[PDB]
């Protein structure tokens, strides 16, 4: 049993977290009471990865729920599957961070962090063999952003040989107007680059554009955006949750996907938003990326593709070979055999077949460049800086975060321009 400890921090964190648990509980055939009423032995075989067992055949998410705002905690508890989370695993303050990273990271968040650790430690010590941690949060706010990144640093000190995995929601002016969001995102990125092993970039920009442009929904709710997030998240954790060969645990996934420790930011893809050739064509389409970057504007270092549903393995193999053949310029030639394929038998809910894509592409720079441009339009005017210096932060800290994020960009550019010869 290789246990994962799940942490959700802040509004976004908690919203997407609850959605995550709904989808996977359905897929593993467990009740909102916490009972197994499924049909397939394959649903229970690796249940331990995400669920603790309490007797009465009751499964309890290994989930920790965190916010400085007491509100969203009621929202989870009154949600569907609100009954399932351990009462003790809820950790609320009352002073909401008011979209201020410093409040989350240095002050109010730092006052609350120690009783979050208490619950982490309690969950961790009960583990047969802990893989590590996944945090769902946004980078735009203050709690998810600041306190989420503080939790990372703090967990890392006590579990330095464990994997730290994040699902990080990147901000977009198309979804939120809160102007200080570029600041919050840059300070977050600075932390994530040094202290996580793997980060799934969930770009709000891209989620908007899929709802508006592909799904044709004129103004999309957070609920429409999150339907995409949960279907993605179900996809990328399939290999952890069901018996299988490839990328079956967080460390093995990291070793296949991370050629250089800083370049650990992944674009996930989904399809459909069907025949095997179409699924394959669609998952590699710019229009199917959960990050707002064109793959055809960089090169792939590594890729994982997960097919779900009853289909021909022969055909998936040929189609994967076909896509690499035809698109060979977009895979670095100095990492051989860098695209891996898993096929799981269980489709997600409502689909006969799906494809989930995880890419480490140098085209992710485009996302960091967007954040850097919006950050630089504030910072050279010292705009809203008093919100941060007001909690004790130096101007030097802003300069450092920015130029580290700039360093990450040129590094992605370096490996894009590199050749075998």
């Amino acid at each position: 049993m290789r246990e994962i400890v799940h942490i959700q921090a802040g509004q976004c964190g908690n919203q997407i977290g609850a959605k995550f648990w709904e989808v996977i509980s359905d897929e593993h055939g467990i009740d909102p009471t916490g009972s197994y009423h499924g049909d397939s032995d394959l649903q229970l075989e690796r249940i331990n990865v995400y669920y603790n067992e309490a007797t009465g055949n009751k499964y309890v998410p290994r989930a920790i729920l965190v916010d400085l705002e007491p509100g969203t905690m009621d929202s989870v508890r009154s949600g569907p599957f609100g009954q399932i989370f351990r009462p003790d695993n809820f950790v609320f303050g009352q002073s909401g961070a008011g979209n201020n990273w410093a409040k989350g990271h240095y002050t109010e968040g730092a006052e609350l962090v120690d009783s979050v650790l208490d619950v982490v430690r309690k969950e961790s010590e009960s583990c047969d063999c802990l893989q590590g941690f996944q945090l769902t949060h946004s980078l735009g706010g203050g709690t998810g952003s600041g306190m989420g990144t503080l939790l990372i640093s703090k967990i890392r000190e006590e579990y330095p040989d464990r994997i730290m995995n994040t699902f990080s929601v990147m901000p977009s002016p198309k979804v939120s107007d809160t102007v200080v969001e570029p600041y919050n995102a840059t300070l977050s990125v600075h932390q994530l680059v040094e202290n996580t092993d793997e980060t799934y970039c969930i770009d709000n920009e891209a989620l908007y554009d899929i709802c508006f442009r592909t799904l044709k929904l004129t103004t999309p709710t957070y609920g429409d955006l999150n339907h995409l997030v949960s279907a993605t998240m179900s996809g990328v954790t399939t290999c952890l949750r069901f018996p299988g060969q490839l990328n079956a645990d967080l460390r093995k996934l990291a070793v296949n996907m991370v050629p250089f420790p800083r370049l650990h930011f992944f674009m996930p893809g989904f399809a459909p938003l069907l025949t095997v050739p179409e699924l394959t064509q669609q998952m590699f389409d710019s229009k199917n990326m959960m990050a707002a970057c064109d793959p055809r504007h960089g090169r792939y270092l590594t890729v994982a593709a997960i097919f779900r549903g009853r289909m021909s393995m022969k055909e998936v193999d040929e189609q994967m070979l076909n896509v690499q053949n035809k698109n060979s310029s977009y895979f670095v030639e100095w990492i051989p055999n860098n695209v891996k394929t898993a096929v799981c038998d269980i489709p997600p809910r409502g689909l006969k077949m799906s494809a989930t894509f995880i890419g480490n592409s140098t085209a992710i720079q485009e996302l960091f460049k967007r954040i850097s441009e919006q950050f630089t339009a504030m910072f050279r005017r010292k705009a809203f800086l008093h919100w941060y210096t007001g909690e004790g932060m130096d101007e030097m800290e802003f300069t450092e975060a920015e130029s580290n994020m700039n360093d990450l960009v040129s590094e992605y550019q370096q490996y894009q321009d590199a050749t075998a010869d």
Binding site: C129, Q245, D249, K252, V255, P259, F260, P261, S312, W334
Partner: protein
Amino acid sequence: MRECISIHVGQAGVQIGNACWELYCLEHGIQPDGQMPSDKTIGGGDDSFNTFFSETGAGKHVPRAVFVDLEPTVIDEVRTGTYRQLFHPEQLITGKEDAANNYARGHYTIGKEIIDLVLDRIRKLADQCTGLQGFLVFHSFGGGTGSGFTSLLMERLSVDYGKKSKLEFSIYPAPQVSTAVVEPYNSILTTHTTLEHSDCAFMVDNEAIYDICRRNLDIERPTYTNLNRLISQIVSSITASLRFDGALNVDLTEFQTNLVPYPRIHFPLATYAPVISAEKAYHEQLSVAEITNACFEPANQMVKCDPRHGKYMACCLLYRGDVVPKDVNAAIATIKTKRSIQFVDWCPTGFKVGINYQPPTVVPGGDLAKVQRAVCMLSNTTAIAEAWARLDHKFDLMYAKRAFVHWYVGEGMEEGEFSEAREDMAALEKDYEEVGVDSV
């Protein structure tokens, strides 16, 4: 006496172990509970099958075998499966955390936690032997445990058992069934580390086996189960000389004398025939000449390489089933005046032949036809070095950028172990070139 101990390491080693041992049981009429009705000597004996099976007072025939994996889920399948009564619980050893496709973890971080326990279990098998001949080690090149733990284990066996022979069955990686980008790293590190500790190593190229399954057995998309059944047939042919006796039987050790001209030149090419479906075998008997001919078809090799473009240093034919020397010699004489068989000038050209009379068995539900006669050719060719050239090239592409190297350094390894392992491989490729040059 002459006992052999089998050590199955990691997922590939273990799953191949299952297939081999199931097949050995069918070959000797041993039931899944270990009982063998035809064995009249209860609790012991010095029969041919005793090289591979020990015997308890209650009539149980027990594999002289240890299964080891750093993770528990593949070994748990042996523990709860068909042949679970065959093995004493202490022969099946598991940790909790695997090597995560990392040689450093298999060799150091994780493997050092379990190595003393494994050597104690091996010691317990060795102590039951009256004349231990040596070890057969089964592992993948690509896995973290298969590479790192095996290399640690081989080093330690050299210490504890001196020069006692150690043979390897090594699974060489293929893109169609591989699970890690870093398999070329793991392959070079293990090959460099075990090279001095191993007497003889049979490389099994997963792509050669995948191709044979697709092409000869009409399997659309072969699984490990397909590959392993075929691998076990080949392993069985090699060990058949140890497990049966007969007039024209020739011991594996005697083939080895011919197969290893210098200690580093110890990687024989295996080729097996016939591989044929039940549908195609029906009413079509393959004669001795047909199967011997199939040995010189490169599509039938266990490693992809072309012997027509290198030189032979030895050639051995291990026949099983309904085969007499007259027919073998006729088939050999035909092939010699018709095939691309060039020897180095320093070794004689005669083929060495052994025949076991016991015909091949197949496992229920498998893909291979039951045939009356089979052959495994073991050759020593300079062409095997192509398999090294391919892996070394993959290693160089990634290593020039230090791609993934931080995963190994993070576990305590230095870059100097990489360049050192790579240099040994360059020197090996060079050795293979030099042995093929004519004498002055």
